[PDB]
mmCIF file with all atom_site columns, C-alpha atoms and ligand atoms in Angstrom:
data_model
loop_
_atom_site.group_PDB
_atom_site.id
_atom_site.type_symbol
_atom_site.label_atom_id
_atom_site.label_alt_id
_atom_site.label_comp_id
_atom_site.label_asym_id
_atom_site.label_entity_id
_atom_site.label_seq_id
_atom_site.pdbx_PDB_ins_code
_atom_site.Cartn_x
_atom_site.Cartn_y
_atom_site.Cartn_z
_atom_site.occupancy
_atom_site.B_iso_or_equiv
_atom_site.pdbx_formal_charge
_atom_site.auth_seq_id
_atom_site.auth_comp_id
_atom_site.auth_asym_id
_atom_site.auth_atom_id
_atom_site.pdbx_PDB_model_num
ATOM   1   C  CA  . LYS A 1 1   ? 5.891   -2.537  81.729  1.00 0.00 ? 1   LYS A CA  1
ATOM   2   C  CA  . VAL A 1 2   ? 4.911   -0.993  78.375  1.00 0.00 ? 2   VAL A CA  1
ATOM   3   C  CA  . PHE A 1 3   ? 3.011   -3.683  76.444  1.00 0.00 ? 3   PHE A CA  1
ATOM   4   C  CA  . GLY A 1 4   ? 2.916   -3.901  72.715  1.00 0.00 ? 4   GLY A CA  1
ATOM   5   C  CA  . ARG A 1 5   ? -0.579  -3.939  71.222  1.00 0.00 ? 5   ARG A CA  1
ATOM   6   C  CA  . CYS A 1 6   ? -0.733  -7.620  70.194  1.00 0.00 ? 6   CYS A CA  1
ATOM   7   C  CA  . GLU A 1 7   ? 1.240   -8.589  73.285  1.00 0.00 ? 7   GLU A CA  1
ATOM   8   C  CA  . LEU A 1 8   ? -1.436  -7.041  75.501  1.00 0.00 ? 8   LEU A CA  1
ATOM   9   C  CA  . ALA A 1 9   ? -4.279  -8.529  73.432  1.00 0.00 ? 9   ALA A CA  1
ATOM   10  C  CA  . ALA A 1 10  ? -2.774  -11.982 73.991  1.00 0.00 ? 10  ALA A CA  1
ATOM   11  C  CA  . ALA A 1 11  ? -2.251  -11.366 77.700  1.00 0.00 ? 11  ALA A CA  1
ATOM   12  C  CA  . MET A 1 12  ? -5.781  -10.059 78.101  1.00 0.00 ? 12  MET A CA  1
ATOM   13  C  CA  . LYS A 1 13  ? -7.135  -13.131 76.286  1.00 0.00 ? 13  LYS A CA  1
ATOM   14  C  CA  . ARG A 1 14  ? -5.112  -15.463 78.529  1.00 0.00 ? 14  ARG A CA  1
ATOM   15  C  CA  . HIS A 1 15  ? -6.479  -13.560 81.539  1.00 0.00 ? 15  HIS A CA  1
ATOM   16  C  CA  . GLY A 1 16  ? -10.075 -14.076 80.403  1.00 0.00 ? 16  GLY A CA  1
ATOM   17  C  CA  . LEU A 1 17  ? -11.235 -10.683 79.121  1.00 0.00 ? 17  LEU A CA  1
ATOM   18  C  CA  . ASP A 1 18  ? -12.195 -11.739 75.561  1.00 0.00 ? 18  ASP A CA  1
ATOM   19  C  CA  . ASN A 1 19  ? -15.966 -11.263 75.482  1.00 0.00 ? 19  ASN A CA  1
ATOM   20  C  CA  . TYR A 1 20  ? -16.068 -10.746 79.270  1.00 0.00 ? 20  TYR A CA  1
ATOM   21  C  CA  . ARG A 1 21  ? -19.497 -9.267  80.032  1.00 0.00 ? 21  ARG A CA  1
ATOM   22  C  CA  . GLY A 1 22  ? -19.948 -9.267  76.232  1.00 0.00 ? 22  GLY A CA  1
ATOM   23  C  CA  . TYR A 1 23  ? -17.014 -6.959  75.524  1.00 0.00 ? 23  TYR A CA  1
ATOM   24  C  CA  . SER A 1 24  ? -14.802 -8.204  72.721  1.00 0.00 ? 24  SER A CA  1
ATOM   25  C  CA  . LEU A 1 25  ? -11.030 -8.212  73.163  1.00 0.00 ? 25  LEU A CA  1
ATOM   26  C  CA  . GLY A 1 26  ? -10.590 -5.094  71.030  1.00 0.00 ? 26  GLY A CA  1
ATOM   27  C  CA  . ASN A 1 27  ? -12.689 -3.047  73.458  1.00 0.00 ? 27  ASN A CA  1
ATOM   28  C  CA  . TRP A 1 28  ? -10.232 -3.868  76.266  1.00 0.00 ? 28  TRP A CA  1
ATOM   29  C  CA  . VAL A 1 29  ? -7.115  -3.206  74.184  1.00 0.00 ? 29  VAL A CA  1
ATOM   30  C  CA  . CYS A 1 30  ? -8.541  0.111   72.948  1.00 0.00 ? 30  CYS A CA  1
ATOM   31  C  CA  . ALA A 1 31  ? -9.436  1.071   76.552  1.00 0.00 ? 31  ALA A CA  1
ATOM   32  C  CA  . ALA A 1 32  ? -5.896  0.297   77.723  1.00 0.00 ? 32  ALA A CA  1
ATOM   33  C  CA  . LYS A 1 33  ? -4.394  2.226   74.840  1.00 0.00 ? 33  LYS A CA  1
ATOM   34  C  CA  . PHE A 1 34  ? -6.241  5.402   75.677  1.00 0.00 ? 34  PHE A CA  1
ATOM   35  C  CA  . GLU A 1 35  ? -6.172  5.019   79.463  1.00 0.00 ? 35  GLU A CA  1
ATOM   36  C  CA  . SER A 1 36  ? -2.466  4.283   79.837  1.00 0.00 ? 36  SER A CA  1
ATOM   37  C  CA  . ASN A 1 37  ? -0.809  3.996   76.439  1.00 0.00 ? 37  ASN A CA  1
ATOM   38  C  CA  . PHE A 1 38  ? -0.283  0.343   77.488  1.00 0.00 ? 38  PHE A CA  1
ATOM   39  C  CA  . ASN A 1 39  ? 1.940   1.329   80.470  1.00 0.00 ? 39  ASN A CA  1
ATOM   40  C  CA  . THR A 1 40  ? 1.256   -0.714  83.620  1.00 0.00 ? 40  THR A CA  1
ATOM   41  C  CA  . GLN A 1 41  ? 2.999   1.918   85.752  1.00 0.00 ? 41  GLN A CA  1
ATOM   42  C  CA  . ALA A 1 42  ? 0.740   4.810   84.641  1.00 0.00 ? 42  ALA A CA  1
ATOM   43  C  CA  . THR A 1 43  ? -0.663  6.930   87.486  1.00 0.00 ? 43  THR A CA  1
ATOM   44  C  CA  . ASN A 1 44  ? -2.783  10.051  87.287  1.00 0.00 ? 44  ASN A CA  1
ATOM   45  C  CA  . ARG A 1 45  ? -4.078  12.222  90.167  1.00 0.00 ? 45  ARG A CA  1
ATOM   46  C  CA  . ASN A 1 46  ? -7.684  13.325  89.883  1.00 0.00 ? 46  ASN A CA  1
ATOM   47  C  CA  . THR A 1 47  ? -8.696  16.794  91.094  1.00 0.00 ? 47  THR A CA  1
ATOM   48  C  CA  . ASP A 1 48  ? -10.745 15.262  93.950  1.00 0.00 ? 48  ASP A CA  1
ATOM   49  C  CA  . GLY A 1 49  ? -7.520  13.732  95.307  1.00 0.00 ? 49  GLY A CA  1
ATOM   50  C  CA  . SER A 1 50  ? -8.128  10.153  94.201  1.00 0.00 ? 50  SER A CA  1
ATOM   51  C  CA  . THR A 1 51  ? -5.621  8.586   91.783  1.00 0.00 ? 51  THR A CA  1
ATOM   52  C  CA  . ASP A 1 52  ? -6.012  6.277   88.786  1.00 0.00 ? 52  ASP A CA  1
ATOM   53  C  CA  . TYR A 1 53  ? -3.612  3.325   88.591  1.00 0.00 ? 53  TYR A CA  1
ATOM   54  C  CA  . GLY A 1 54  ? -2.318  1.016   85.925  1.00 0.00 ? 54  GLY A CA  1
ATOM   55  C  CA  . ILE A 1 55  ? -3.037  -0.049  82.410  1.00 0.00 ? 55  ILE A CA  1
ATOM   56  C  CA  . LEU A 1 56  ? -6.798  0.561   82.848  1.00 0.00 ? 56  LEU A CA  1
ATOM   57  C  CA  . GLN A 1 57  ? -6.492  3.570   85.175  1.00 0.00 ? 57  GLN A CA  1
ATOM   58  C  CA  . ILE A 1 58  ? -8.590  2.118   87.999  1.00 0.00 ? 58  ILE A CA  1
ATOM   59  C  CA  . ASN A 1 59  ? -9.549  4.797   90.537  1.00 0.00 ? 59  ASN A CA  1
ATOM   60  C  CA  . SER A 1 60  ? -8.806  4.692   94.293  1.00 0.00 ? 60  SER A CA  1
ATOM   61  C  CA  . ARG A 1 61  ? -12.122 6.543   94.878  1.00 0.00 ? 61  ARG A CA  1
ATOM   62  C  CA  . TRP A 1 62  ? -13.876 3.149   94.665  1.00 0.00 ? 62  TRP A CA  1
ATOM   63  C  CA  . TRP A 1 63  ? -11.732 0.221   93.740  1.00 0.00 ? 63  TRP A CA  1
ATOM   64  C  CA  . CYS A 1 64  ? -8.366  0.004   95.491  1.00 0.00 ? 64  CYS A CA  1
ATOM   65  C  CA  . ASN A 1 65  ? -6.647  1.279   98.641  1.00 0.00 ? 65  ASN A CA  1
ATOM   66  C  CA  . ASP A 1 66  ? -3.854  3.838   98.492  1.00 0.00 ? 66  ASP A CA  1
ATOM   67  C  CA  . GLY A 1 67  ? -4.204  5.250   102.010 1.00 0.00 ? 67  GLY A CA  1
ATOM   68  C  CA  . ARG A 1 68  ? -4.608  8.804   100.738 1.00 0.00 ? 68  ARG A CA  1
ATOM   69  C  CA  . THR A 1 69  ? -8.128  9.056   99.357  1.00 0.00 ? 69  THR A CA  1
ATOM   70  C  CA  . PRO A 1 70  ? -10.273 9.979   102.372 1.00 0.00 ? 70  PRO A CA  1
ATOM   71  C  CA  . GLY A 1 71  ? -13.729 8.451   102.418 1.00 0.00 ? 71  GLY A CA  1
ATOM   72  C  CA  . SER A 1 72  ? -12.979 6.100   99.547  1.00 0.00 ? 72  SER A CA  1
ATOM   73  C  CA  . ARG A 1 73  ? -13.750 2.429   99.142  1.00 0.00 ? 73  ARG A CA  1
ATOM   74  C  CA  . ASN A 1 74  ? -11.567 -0.545  98.171  1.00 0.00 ? 74  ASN A CA  1
ATOM   75  C  CA  . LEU A 1 75  ? -14.058 -2.735  96.321  1.00 0.00 ? 75  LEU A CA  1
ATOM   76  C  CA  . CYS A 1 76  ? -11.416 -4.873  94.572  1.00 0.00 ? 76  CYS A CA  1
ATOM   77  C  CA  . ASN A 1 77  ? -9.796  -5.530  97.980  1.00 0.00 ? 77  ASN A CA  1
ATOM   78  C  CA  . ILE A 1 78  ? -6.297  -4.625  96.826  1.00 0.00 ? 78  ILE A CA  1
ATOM   79  C  CA  . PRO A 1 79  ? -3.576  -2.052  97.311  1.00 0.00 ? 79  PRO A CA  1
ATOM   80  C  CA  . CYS A 1 80  ? -3.577  0.314   94.359  1.00 0.00 ? 80  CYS A CA  1
ATOM   81  C  CA  . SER A 1 81  ? 0.085   -0.582  93.871  1.00 0.00 ? 81  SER A CA  1
ATOM   82  C  CA  . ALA A 1 82  ? -0.988  -4.083  92.774  1.00 0.00 ? 82  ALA A CA  1
ATOM   83  C  CA  . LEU A 1 83  ? -2.443  -2.425  89.698  1.00 0.00 ? 83  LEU A CA  1
ATOM   84  C  CA  . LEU A 1 84  ? 1.025   -1.280  88.536  1.00 0.00 ? 84  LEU A CA  1
ATOM   85  C  CA  . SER A 1 85  ? 2.561   -4.726  88.181  1.00 0.00 ? 85  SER A CA  1
ATOM   86  C  CA  . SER A 1 86  ? 4.067   -6.203  85.004  1.00 0.00 ? 86  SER A CA  1
ATOM   87  C  CA  . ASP A 1 87  ? 1.643   -9.091  85.742  1.00 0.00 ? 87  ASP A CA  1
ATOM   88  C  CA  . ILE A 1 88  ? -1.835  -7.848  84.732  1.00 0.00 ? 88  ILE A CA  1
ATOM   89  C  CA  . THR A 1 89  ? -3.736  -10.245 87.049  1.00 0.00 ? 89  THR A CA  1
ATOM   90  C  CA  . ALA A 1 90  ? -4.821  -7.672  89.642  1.00 0.00 ? 90  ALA A CA  1
ATOM   91  C  CA  . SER A 1 91  ? -5.847  -5.091  87.019  1.00 0.00 ? 91  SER A CA  1
ATOM   92  C  CA  . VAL A 1 92  ? -7.781  -7.688  85.061  1.00 0.00 ? 92  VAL A CA  1
ATOM   93  C  CA  . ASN A 1 93  ? -9.543  -9.134  88.092  1.00 0.00 ? 93  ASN A CA  1
ATOM   94  C  CA  . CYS A 1 94  ? -10.519 -5.690  89.289  1.00 0.00 ? 94  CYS A CA  1
ATOM   95  C  CA  . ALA A 1 95  ? -11.683 -4.607  85.815  1.00 0.00 ? 95  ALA A CA  1
ATOM   96  C  CA  . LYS A 1 96  ? -13.888 -7.703  85.722  1.00 0.00 ? 96  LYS A CA  1
ATOM   97  C  CA  . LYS A 1 97  ? -15.567 -6.482  88.925  1.00 0.00 ? 97  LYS A CA  1
ATOM   98  C  CA  . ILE A 1 98  ? -15.973 -2.969  87.527  1.00 0.00 ? 98  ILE A CA  1
ATOM   99  C  CA  . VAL A 1 99  ? -17.469 -3.976  84.190  1.00 0.00 ? 99  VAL A CA  1
ATOM   100 C  CA  . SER A 1 100 ? -19.917 -6.283  86.011  1.00 0.00 ? 100 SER A CA  1
ATOM   101 C  CA  . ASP A 1 101 ? -21.343 -3.582  88.269  1.00 0.00 ? 101 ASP A CA  1
ATOM   102 C  CA  . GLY A 1 102 ? -24.081 -2.159  86.009  1.00 0.00 ? 102 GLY A CA  1
ATOM   103 C  CA  . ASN A 1 103 ? -22.573 0.504   83.711  1.00 0.00 ? 103 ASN A CA  1
ATOM   104 C  CA  . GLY A 1 104 ? -20.354 -1.820  81.706  1.00 0.00 ? 104 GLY A CA  1
ATOM   105 C  CA  . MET A 1 105 ? -17.293 -0.289  80.088  1.00 0.00 ? 105 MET A CA  1
ATOM   106 C  CA  . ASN A 1 106 ? -18.778 3.236   80.383  1.00 0.00 ? 106 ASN A CA  1
ATOM   107 C  CA  . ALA A 1 107 ? -16.876 3.302   83.708  1.00 0.00 ? 107 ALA A CA  1
ATOM   108 C  CA  . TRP A 1 108 ? -13.793 4.007   81.578  1.00 0.00 ? 108 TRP A CA  1
ATOM   109 C  CA  . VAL A 1 109 ? -14.121 7.545   80.288  1.00 0.00 ? 109 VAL A CA  1
ATOM   110 C  CA  . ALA A 1 110 ? -11.483 7.017   77.573  1.00 0.00 ? 110 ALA A CA  1
ATOM   111 C  CA  . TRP A 1 111 ? -13.410 3.944   76.403  1.00 0.00 ? 111 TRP A CA  1
ATOM   112 C  CA  . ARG A 1 112 ? -16.703 5.818   76.179  1.00 0.00 ? 112 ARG A CA  1
ATOM   113 C  CA  . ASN A 1 113 ? -15.119 8.792   74.407  1.00 0.00 ? 113 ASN A CA  1
ATOM   114 C  CA  . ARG A 1 114 ? -12.589 7.081   72.139  1.00 0.00 ? 114 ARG A CA  1
ATOM   115 C  CA  . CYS A 1 115 ? -13.502 3.400   71.721  1.00 0.00 ? 115 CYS A CA  1
ATOM   116 C  CA  . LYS A 1 116 ? -17.266 3.033   72.067  1.00 0.00 ? 116 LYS A CA  1
ATOM   117 C  CA  . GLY A 1 117 ? -18.933 2.792   68.671  1.00 0.00 ? 117 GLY A CA  1
ATOM   118 C  CA  . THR A 1 118 ? -15.637 2.516   66.766  1.00 0.00 ? 118 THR A CA  1
ATOM   119 C  CA  . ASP A 1 119 ? -14.120 -0.398  64.895  1.00 0.00 ? 119 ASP A CA  1
ATOM   120 C  CA  . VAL A 1 120 ? -12.475 -1.876  67.973  1.00 0.00 ? 120 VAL A CA  1
ATOM   121 C  CA  . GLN A 1 121 ? -11.470 -5.053  66.125  1.00 0.00 ? 121 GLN A CA  1
ATOM   122 C  CA  . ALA A 1 122 ? -8.706  -3.017  64.489  1.00 0.00 ? 122 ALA A CA  1
ATOM   123 C  CA  . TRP A 1 123 ? -6.920  -3.155  67.864  1.00 0.00 ? 123 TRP A CA  1
ATOM   124 C  CA  . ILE A 1 124 ? -6.496  -6.917  67.626  1.00 0.00 ? 124 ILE A CA  1
ATOM   125 C  CA  . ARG A 1 125 ? -6.062  -7.011  63.814  1.00 0.00 ? 125 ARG A CA  1
ATOM   126 C  CA  . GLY A 1 126 ? -3.318  -9.410  62.780  1.00 0.00 ? 126 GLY A CA  1
ATOM   127 C  CA  . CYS A 1 127 ? -2.511  -10.541 66.337  1.00 0.00 ? 127 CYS A CA  1
ATOM   128 C  CA  . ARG A 1 128 ? -1.896  -14.227 66.978  1.00 0.00 ? 128 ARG A CA  1
ATOM   129 C  CA  . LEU A 1 129 ? -4.599  -15.084 69.522  1.00 0.00 ? 129 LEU A CA  1
HETATM 130 CL CL1 . LIG B 2 .   ? -7.672  5.884   101.631 1.00 0.00 ? 1   LIG B CL1 1
HETATM 131 CL CL1 . LIG B 2 .   ? -22.877 -3.901  79.016  1.00 0.00 ? 2   LIG B CL1 1
HETATM 132 NA NA1 . LIG B 2 .   ? -9.707  3.628   98.083  1.00 0.00 ? 3   LIG B NA1 1
#
């Protein structure tokens, strides 16, 4: 599924990300925009052989099982495929674990490089929330 901007902001709010670990809703929408262009089916192979999955590009190196990332962990206790669903539950629940683990949203490279320090409220501007 390719979410619209305000559509995703509303879904993310319903799924409990607004101000989760102190990160306002616009931080999460901005992260999704630059990680996946709001496409739940986005996958990208990293040069180490791990793959990033879903709207927040969660990496099989640590967070999910795809059966083809030797030596990796599955800290969210899910198949990576769960992260590709139209239903954002598994991505959201895993992201909540990630953002809680010490480094905050810096875990998302696109967030650090393209969202951090910017006017992230523009991403939810005008949305019915
Ligand atoms: Cl694996
Ligand atoms: Cl933080
Ligand atoms: Na893994």
